[PDB]
Amino acid sequence: MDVNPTLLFLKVPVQNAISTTFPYTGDPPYSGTGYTMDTVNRTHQYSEKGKWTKNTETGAPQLNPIDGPLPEDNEPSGYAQTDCVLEAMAFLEESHPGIFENSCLETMEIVQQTRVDKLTQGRQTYDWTLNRNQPAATALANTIEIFRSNGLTANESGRLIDFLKDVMESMDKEEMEITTHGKKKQRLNKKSYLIRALTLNTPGMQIRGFVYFVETLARSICEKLEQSGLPVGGNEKKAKLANVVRKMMTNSQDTELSFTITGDNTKWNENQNPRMFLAMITYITRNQPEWFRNVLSIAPIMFSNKMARLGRGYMFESKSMKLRTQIPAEMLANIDLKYFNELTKKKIEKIRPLLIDGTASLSPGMMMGMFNMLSTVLGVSILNLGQKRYTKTTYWWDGLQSSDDFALIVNAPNHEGIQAGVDRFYRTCKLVGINMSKKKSYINRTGTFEFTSFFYRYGFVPSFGVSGINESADMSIGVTVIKNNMINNDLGPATAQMALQLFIKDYRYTYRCHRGDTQIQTRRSFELEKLWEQTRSKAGLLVSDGGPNLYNIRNLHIPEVCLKWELMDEDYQGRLCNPLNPFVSHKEIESVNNAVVSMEYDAVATTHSWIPKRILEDEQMYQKCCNLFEKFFPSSSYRRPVGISSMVEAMVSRARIDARIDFESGRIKKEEFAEIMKICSTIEELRRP
Amino acid sequence: YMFESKSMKLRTQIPAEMLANIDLKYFNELTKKKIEKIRPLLIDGTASLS
Amino acid sequence: FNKACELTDSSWIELDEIGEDVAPIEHIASMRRNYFTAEVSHCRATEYIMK
Structure with missing residues (x-):
C-alpha cells in the first residue's frame, strides 16, 4: 500500500481537513537588487501609455497614467479614471450618510493631541541622515539633531504636526549640513537633499508623519463600513463573513441565484496610483479646515515623487582568482554591461533612464503598506456600487474586502445574470484601478468560500x-x-x-x-x-x-x-x-x-x-537625563509627568527639599548636607547663562 | 444496579440480566461476594431458590 | 514515506506531566490524548522527530 495522505479528502471535505494542506507550523527557515529592479520595471510596463514628465524639483522622469487610455485586454493595467474614483466615493458617501465628515472630526482630535514620539513606535526605517537602515527611535533622534543644527527647532513643542511643519520648512532650505561623529561635516545641495527625503527602501523618517494621519483617517472610515474587515482581527472578521453570507443566501425567492467569487487582486501594489489617493482624500476632506487638507494630502503628494533605492548591487566573481566584489547600486547607471548576464542586461537596460544618482523614479506605483487601509476604502467603494440602486437591474452584489482579499457575492436571477454581474464588477474595478486576478479567483455557488485564510463551509473552520x-x-x-x-x-x-x-x-x-x-x-x-x-x-x-x-x-x-x-x-x-x-x-x-x-x-x-543580557555624540544622552529624572521623581516611570518648570529646576528643587527634611531627621550627617546645598548652588549658577 | 461516576458526572444502570457476565470490578466488596456466590445459580436471568 | 508511516517496537516519545484531572472535560481530553499517543508513540515518524 503506497500511502497517499491527500486521498483522505475522498471522505472528509477539504475544508474540514484543511489543516493538513498547510505544511509549515511555524516560520520556514528559508527566505536582492534584482527583485527591486523587476518591481520598478513592471510598474512602468503597466503604464506605458502615460504622460512622461520631468519633475522640476527632484529632476526625476515621472510617469502619469491617470485618465489614460482605457485597457484593451485582460492584462493588468493602471489607467484609472479620476471621474470614476470620485463618483465611486460620492456614491459611497450617499449610502453611508455623513461618513467622511463624521470621520474627519475623529481625526481632528488625533492630528492635534498626537506627540512627536509616535514616529518612534514602529519597525526599522530608512535614515536620511546616513543612507542606512536604523531603528525608528534613533532615526528620529538623528533627524531631530540635524534639524536643530540646521536651525529648524519648531519640533520642540512636542506636537507631531509641528515636526511636520519642520520637515516642510527643511524641504525649502538651500543646504542641509549634516555633522557626523571623526567629526566630518557634509553639506547637501537642495536637490541632493530632496531625493534623499523622497526615498523608499528595499520610506524615510520625513514621511512617517503624514502617512500616519492618512492611515488613521482611513482606519476611522473603515471602522464605520461593515464591508471592510481590515481594521479588525479574528472574531470580528468571523462575524462579517457570516452576516454577509446569511444576508445574501437567504433569498426571499428561489429565483435568486447566489454566487461567490473568492479571489484576489493581482499586482495590487503596482497599480494603486498615489495620484488616485490624493484624488480621494481631497473628496473625503470636503468643507474641512484648510489646514486639515494640507496635512492629510501631503503623503499622496510625496509618494507620487518617490525615488526608490535599488539596494546593494550585484557581485562579480572570476572562476580563476575566485574574487568577489559588490558593484554598489550607485555605479550601475555609469558602467559597462559586458559583465552582466542576459536577464540582468535587459533589466538594467530597461531601468537605466529612470535612474537618478542611483535612485529609481517609481512614481506610478505604491509600495507595500503605505495606505494599506485607504486602498481598502477604495475597494469597498466598488463593493458599494452594487446595492441594486446603482445597478438599476436585477443583479446585485455585496461582499467584503481586506486589501487584496474579497469575497464578492453576485446575487442574480439566472446564470446569464450572474455572468453579467461578474463582468460589470470586473470592468468597474478595472476603471477604478483594481485589477482582479483571474489565475487565483474561482466562482462557485454560495455555501462555501474562502477569505484571507478563513475557510467558510456552512460554518467556519507558530506561537507554542x-x-x-x-x-x-x-x-x-x-x-x-x-x-x-x-x-x-x-x-x-x-x-x-x-x-x-x-x-x-x-x-x-x-x-x-x-x-x-x-x-x-x-x-x-x-x-x-x-x-x-x-x-x-x-x-x-x-x-x-x-x-x-x-x-x-x-x-x-x-x-x-x-x-x-x-x-x-x-x-x-x-x-x-x-x-x-x-x-x-x-x-x-x-x-x-x-x-x-x-x-x-x-x-x-x-x-x-x-x-x-544584550548622528548623535552620546546616544544615551536622553536616556541619561530621563534615568536621572526618574531617580529624582520615582513616579516618572508610571504617569507621564506634568509641570511647568524645566527638568533641571525641578530636580534641584527636589534635591534641596529632600536634603533639608533629611538633615532635620539626622540621616545625612550635616557635613554632607552643606556639600549637597553648595552643589545645588553651583548647578543653579550654571543655569544662569 | 446503578453505577455513578462522580468524576465524569455519569449515572448509568445495569439490569439484573447482565449480572451473569459483567466484570466484577465496579461493585464494592460485599456486593462482589454476593454476585460471585450467586452466579452458579443464575439461569435465564433468574436464580433457582429451591 | 511508506516506511515512515509504520510502527516499531519502541516508545519513542516520553511527554511531560500534567496536573490532576478534575473537569469532566479534562478527563475526556486525557482519554483522547492517551489514545492518540498510544496510536502514535511508536511510528517511525516519531523516531525522526526525536532524532
Whole structure:
C-alpha cells in the first residue's frame, strides 16, 4: 500500500481537513537588487501609455497614467479614471450618510493631541541622515539633531504636526549640513537633499508623519463600513463573513441565484496610483479646515515623487582568482554591461533612464503598506456600487474586502445574470484601478468560500514554546496562548493538553529546569537537586525551580505563583518573593507585564523575573537625563509627568527639599548636607547663562 | 444496579440480566461476594431458590 | 514515506506531566490524548522527530 495522505479528502471535505494542506507550523527557515529592479520595471510596463514628465524639483522622469487610455485586454493595467474614483466615493458617501465628515472630526482630535514620539513606535526605517537602515527611535533622534543644527527647532513643542511643519520648512532650505561623529561635516545641495527625503527602501523618517494621519483617517472610515474587515482581527472578521453570507443566501425567492467569487487582486501594489489617493482624500476632506487638507494630502503628494533605492548591487566573481566584489547600486547607471548576464542586461537596460544618482523614479506605483487601509476604502467603494440602486437591474452584489482579499457575492436571477454581474464588477474595478486576478479567483455557488485564510463551509473552520524573556514570564505567556487559541481559534481540549505538555518540555529543556528527582545532568542540576531535598512540600516548587506541574485546563489562566501558594513553603515563599532581589528589574509601566512576542501576561514578580543580557555624540544622552529624572521623581516611570518648570529646576528643587527634611531627621550627617546645598548652588549658577 | 461516576458526572444502570457476565470490578466488596456466590445459580436471568 | 508511516517496537516519545484531572472535560481530553499517543508513540515518524 503506497500511502497517499491527500486521498483522505475522498471522505472528509477539504475544508474540514484543511489543516493538513498547510505544511509549515511555524516560520520556514528559508527566505536582492534584482527583485527591486523587476518591481520598478513592471510598474512602468503597466503604464506605458502615460504622460512622461520631468519633475522640476527632484529632476526625476515621472510617469502619469491617470485618465489614460482605457485597457484593451485582460492584462493588468493602471489607467484609472479620476471621474470614476470620485463618483465611486460620492456614491459611497450617499449610502453611508455623513461618513467622511463624521470621520474627519475623529481625526481632528488625533492630528492635534498626537506627540512627536509616535514616529518612534514602529519597525526599522530608512535614515536620511546616513543612507542606512536604523531603528525608528534613533532615526528620529538623528533627524531631530540635524534639524536643530540646521536651525529648524519648531519640533520642540512636542506636537507631531509641528515636526511636520519642520520637515516642510527643511524641504525649502538651500543646504542641509549634516555633522557626523571623526567629526566630518557634509553639506547637501537642495536637490541632493530632496531625493534623499523622497526615498523608499528595499520610506524615510520625513514621511512617517503624514502617512500616519492618512492611515488613521482611513482606519476611522473603515471602522464605520461593515464591508471592510481590515481594521479588525479574528472574531470580528468571523462575524462579517457570516452576516454577509446569511444576508445574501437567504433569498426571499428561489429565483435568486447566489454566487461567490473568492479571489484576489493581482499586482495590487503596482497599480494603486498615489495620484488616485490624493484624488480621494481631497473628496473625503470636503468643507474641512484648510489646514486639515494640507496635512492629510501631503503623503499622496510625496509618494507620487518617490525615488526608490535599488539596494546593494550585484557581485562579480572570476572562476580563476575566485574574487568577489559588490558593484554598489550607485555605479550601475555609469558602467559597462559586458559583465552582466542576459536577464540582468535587459533589466538594467530597461531601468537605466529612470535612474537618478542611483535612485529609481517609481512614481506610478505604491509600495507595500503605505495606505494599506485607504486602498481598502477604495475597494469597498466598488463593493458599494452594487446595492441594486446603482445597478438599476436585477443583479446585485455585496461582499467584503481586506486589501487584496474579497469575497464578492453576485446575487442574480439566472446564470446569464450572474455572468453579467461578474463582468460589470470586473470592468468597474478595472476603471477604478483594481485589477482582479483571474489565475487565483474561482466562482462557485454560495455555501462555501474562502477569505484571507478563513475557510467558510456552512460554518467556519507558530506561537507554542518559550517566548524567551524570563522564566516566570514564559510559564505565563505560553499558558496564556494555550487558552487564547483554545477560546478563539477552536483549539480543542486534547490538543490543548498536548500543547501544554510539549511547552513544558521545551521550557525545562531551554531553562534547564528538569525536576529534582529526575537525573538529567546540566549546569543547574546540582543546585536544583539540593533545593529538591530541603523542601518538605514539593508540589509548591515552581516549574522554573525543580518542581512539578499543575496546569491542566481548569487553571490555564491562574498565574503559577498564585497557583502554588497554599502548597509552598514559608522558607521558600520568603526567598522566592523577596522584594530585595538583585534579579527583579522593571523600569517602566510599559514593560511591567508586556512582551513584544505586545502581549498582556500575568506574573507575580518573583526572583525569576530577571532580564536577559544584550548622528548623535552620546546616544544615551536622553536616556541619561530621563534615568536621572526618574531617580529624582520615582513616579516618572508610571504617569507621564506634568509641570511647568524645566527638568533641571525641578530636580534641584527636589534635591534641596529632600536634603533639608533629611538633615532635620539626622540621616545625612550635616557635613554632607552643606556639600549637597553648595552643589545645588553651583548647578543653579550654571543655569544662569 | 446503578453505577455513578462522580468524576465524569455519569449515572448509568445495569439490569439484573447482565449480572451473569459483567466484570466484577465496579461493585464494592460485599456486593462482589454476593454476585460471585450467586452466579452458579443464575439461569435465564433468574436464580433457582429451591 | 511508506516506511515512515509504520510502527516499531519502541516508545519513542516520553511527554511531560500534567496536573490532576478534575473537569469532566479534562478527563475526556486525557482519554483522547492517551489514545492518540498510544496510536502514535511508536511510528517511525516519531523516531525522526526525536532524532
